[PDB]
Design a protein around this ligand. Structure first.
Ligand SMILES: O=c1ccn([C@@H]2O[C@H](COP(=O)(O)OP(=O)(O)OP(=O)(O)O)[C@@H](O)[C@H]2O)c(=O)[nH]1
Length: 338
RNA sequence: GCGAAGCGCUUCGCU
RNA sequence: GCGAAGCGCUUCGCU
């Protein structure tokens, strides 16, 4: 790794604005939020024609406080008043949805760990994923939402990370990379682990079980000053934290021995979890390693993207060539980061 | 035993 | 469907 020159005050002010701009440019307007709602509304009534009692609910970015323009729509389906063959139900869902003049490219994915019917929504141009009884997903949505409300910099960094993985083309788990949900967990972990914490761990501040998993977490975001020790302690700018995250995952954190675990504050090791051979534990489904599908080719691309991320965000310059219309295209240049 | 392409086949992955 | 990793066969290659 290269030595990094000291941060100037003014290159850091640029880092702060660039991170905040990631939130403003990509957080959704009310019109986009409601377009998603309508999609959930319409599909529910349409599916109810064949499967009465069908309840659809959104989760993921559409509802976890990290809504991101043009993200795919995550939908969880259950049936009110209800050993359900999920493989068969996904194909049943597919057969139903091909009759919808507003949908195209209906595709059932039965063999995935989480089976989904994936399709394209004409009016909105969004891609939609319907899964069945994805109840843990509804709860990690509420949990991320609680983190998103603790401190403004949590959104700023999570948005900046979503922009970054998109440009580096490293955020598609269907092409062997990591999923957005994984990167968000990496951000929240980094903020729980830096000294002093920016966020606490909310499931350490009660046993509520769903699918045999304790889904409890502290969620009254109006009263953490009472119950979180290091509240208000960390004063650092968002641009320092974003460069801090890139350095944290390229210089300090040892992926070979430690699990990225937002559920509890202390170190969780590769050895205890039997996950010896990037390792990320789901906040609730503790048997699910979100890095279990990574190739070592793919881990290298991710590591390479983080390293050039460290370079362009860490080497001060001013100015920037008037070629660029704004700082955004300088920092998030896809060729540079790849 | 090794490389390239084509045509088939299988296994793993995808919220 | 898409991504990855294999196996079959054929054709052409191995100094
Ligand atoms: O490994 C996974 C992946 C996905 N999911 C669940 O599916 C949802 C959709 O997962 P996505 O991969 O679509 O992430 P996203 O665009 O919603 O981005 P984030 O806000 O999640 O960073 C995620 O928000 C998560 O709740 C899991 O529970 N586990």
């Amino acid at each position: 790794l290269e030595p990094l020159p000291p941060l100037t005050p003014k290159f850091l002010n640029i880092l702060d604005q660039v991170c905040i701009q990631c939130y403003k440019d990509f957080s959704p307007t009310i019109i986009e939020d409601q377009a998603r709602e309508h999609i959930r509304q319409n599909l529910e009534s349409f599916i109810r024609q064949d499967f009465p009692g069908t309840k659809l609910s959104l989760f993921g970015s559409s509802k976890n406080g990290f809504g991101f323009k043009q993200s795919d729509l995550d939908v969880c389906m259950t049936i009110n008043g209800l050993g359900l063959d999920c493989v068969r139900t996904i194909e049943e869902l597919a057969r139903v949805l091909r009759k919808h003049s507003g949908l195209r490219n209906i595709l059932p994915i039965t063999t995935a760990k989480v089976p989904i019917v994936k399709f394209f929504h004409l009016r909105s141009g969004l891609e939609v994923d319907i899964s069945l009884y994805n109840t843990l997903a509804l709860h990690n949505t509420r949990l991320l939402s609680a983190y998103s409300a603790i401190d403004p910099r949590v959104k700023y960094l999570c948005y900046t990370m979503k922009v970054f993985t998109k440009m580096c083309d490293i955020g598609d788990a269907s092409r062997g990379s990591l999923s957005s949900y994984a990167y968000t967990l990496m951000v929240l972990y980094f903020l729980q682990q830096r000294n002093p914490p920016v966020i606490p761990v909310l499931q350490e501040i009660p046993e509520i079980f769903v699918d045999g998993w304790n889904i409890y977490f502290f969620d009254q975001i109006d009263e953490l000053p009472t119950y979180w020790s290091e509240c208000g302690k960390n004063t650092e700018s968002v641009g320092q934290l974003w460069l801090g995250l890139l350095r944290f995952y390229t210089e300090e954190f040892d992926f070979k021995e430690h699990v990225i675990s937002i559920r509890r504050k202390s170190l969780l090791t590769t050895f205890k979890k039997q996950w010896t051979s990037i390792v990320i534990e789901d906040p609730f489904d503790l048997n699910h390693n979100l890095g279990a599908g990574l190739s070592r080719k793919m881990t290298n691309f991710i590591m390479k993207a983080f390293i050039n991320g460290r370079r362009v965000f860490g080497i001060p310059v001013k100015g920037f060539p008037k070629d660029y219309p704004s700082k955004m295209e300088y920092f998030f240049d896809p060729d540079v980061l790849t």
